[PDB]
Structure 1
């Protein structure tokens, strides 16, 4: 594949469930590697915008492009080394940064598709239909799911609502936009954001660009707007067969607060977000990047400054670790709405048999 390891930073005595670091700067790249994937990796290394949902879509697009580029060889067959290539790609992705359940599902589907179509069929005719099928899948298991979510929201949400959210949950943003402009109702939307990621800020900016009244929030306090807050949706990434949620940042805290004060929380998701794997703590599987998001003194991301911060090894023993993905609870997110419209997260795998 190329070059691996050779990186600074200690193994850390506290929290080491997954490996922590990689390929950022390109040197001596292989001939067969498609550059799009490399570009994507480069983006992800220092990404602000995407989270869970759009990433998968991007991956799908890339795969489609790859398929379009590839034709059946004379020596090797269509199902000879494709699988190997896929595996290699997956490995590369893993090396870059750990992935989502949706992505895995997509991979599985692709594998199934590969298994399905026999190599004896005409090649031109084959991918003509295959690509169409892929497109159809994309339409159904993403856009249609989103549409369904929107419609669920429509029946449920009262005549004009104050809405609170966290992160970069693209579907939810889209829904908000729809509420603002398409169906036309009052949108007192409150967005919270942390230090390491400027996702919330970005979302706010986007809302402003569409013409929405936004309330910006940080870690130090949340309750200042609560003690008034009436209806809340949480940030989503992946669901388990427990009834729990594996999501981003201090969403758990927010959920807890909601539970304490007046009203519970609800999350809407895609029907292909669900896993069959299970966990129950923020120690199980940790998603990590480099401890550098808080080294630069606030404000913007690319700055390059002279000051005081930058003591990972310089002074007498110092560690500056963080986490990205944490455990969201069960007793509080009562709502789960998918391609099967209605249900509770207490019914943690009721749709897994039906699919």
Structure 2
């Protein structure tokens, strides 16, 4: 199977809902694992760019590739060990890093597809139509959905607007690009970034590469830029069946600020991002990473410096724990643009029954 247990850093007295560590350096691997999965795992382990949306697409692509490479054996049938393989892959993924609802949905869809086609049809003809179908699905629930979202944004966003964004959600970046080049509008895009992740920075860079006026913002200096700000979009990850946004980093604070100061908050989301599972706080299900990211002085990601920090077990009780994903409130984000055009966050799972 690989490597299990034996990890640095304590279990911690505060916040221990999920397991904290997993394979990063490859040693003794099974002689049946597809390299693309391994590469993906390697990437995710230390990624800066992707967040929720592109990850799922990547996964889908990988799956497609696997299917293309797969052929029906003489002894075992098409539906004999494929499911087992999928399960193994899932387990590997989980071991690497906790997964999203979209991925789960995709898995479910795949499972359904497996059941649908009966093991009697010609093998070459089977996968030919399968990969086409999967492509079609991808086009529909992602690209077309993105387009729909863009169009929704278009009718709502006024002439000459100031937008404040967080994270590295691809859809928002696409929207901003559209605003810049295709429609041609006056845009002021303020992007906020945190210590361990340089997603905001990346977004800013991307904007620059197009030709947009960008203000770089931080958590320490928030109130100075608001007091002027008209419209705020948040980096969406998943909407729960209560009306709460399970999202990345200090978006909740921003939302609170928005609520305090005049204008309501807006959220752009996909039709398949919705979850039937329910939770109402950050303590419920936390996504964790290694405290090794916050040791060095900032500036850039790879530095390797000698200074003062570099003790987790050496000094007299030192805990340096952080959270990657937090909870955003219910009443504060009201706007939701999805595959079913219009709706609010109070409307929690009306689209879930409609599918």
Residue in 2 aligned with 1:284? 284
| Alignment coverage as a number of residue pairs | 355
Find the aligned partners of 1:2 and 1:195 in 2 and give their Cα distance. Answer: 32
Residue in 2 aligned with 1:220? 220
CA deviation profile, 1:143-178 (whole Å, cap 9, x unmatched): 000000000001111112111100001100110010
Find the aligned partners of 2:335 and 2:346 in 1 and give their Cα distance. Answer: 9
Structure 2 counterpart SS, 1:57: helix
User: 14-23 or 298-307, which moves further after superposition?
Assistant: 298-307
Find the aligned partners of 1:227 and 1:172 in 2 and give their Cα distance. Answer: 24
Q: Alignment RMSD, CA only?
A: 0.6
User: What TM-score does the superposition give when structure 1 sets the normalisation length?
Assistant: 0.99
What stretches of structure 2 of length at least 5 have no aligned partner? none
User: 127-136 or 297-306, which moves further after superposition?
Assistant: 297-306
User: 308-317 or 69-78, which moves further after superposition?
Assistant: 308-317
Find the aligned partners of 2:53 and 2:316 in 1 and give their Cα distance. Answer: 42
Find the aligned partners of 2:11 and 2:210 in 1 and give their Cα distance. Answer: 45
CA shift at 1:235, angstroms? 1.1
CA shift at 1:223, angstroms? 1.4
Find the aligned partners of 2:9 and 2:159 in 1 and give their Cα distance. Answer: 53
Find the aligned partners of 1:3 and 1:222 in 2 and give their Cα distance. Answer: 43
Find the aligned partners of 2:171 and 2:198 in 1 and give their Cα distance. Answer: 18
Residue in 1 aligned with 2:8? 8
CA shift at 1:6, angstroms? 1.4
Structure 1 counterpart SS, 2:36: helix
CA shift at 1:24, angstroms? 0.3
CA shift at 1:306, angstroms? 1.1
Find the aligned partners of 1:114 and 1:78 in 2 and give their Cα distance. Answer: 9
Find the aligned partners of 1:326 and 1:28 in 2 and give their Cα distance. Answer: 36
User: 97-106 or 216-225, which moves further after superposition?
Assistant: 216-225
CA deviation profile, 1:223-277 (whole Å, cap 9, x unmatched): 1111000111111111100011100011000000000001110101000000100
Find the aligned partners of 2:291 and 2:86 in 1 and give their Cα distance. Answer: 31
User: What TM-score does the superposition give when structure 2 sets the normalisation length?
Assistant: 0.99
CA shift at 1:350, angstroms? 0.6
CA deviation profile, 1:307-328 (whole Å, cap 9, x unmatched): 1101101111111010000000
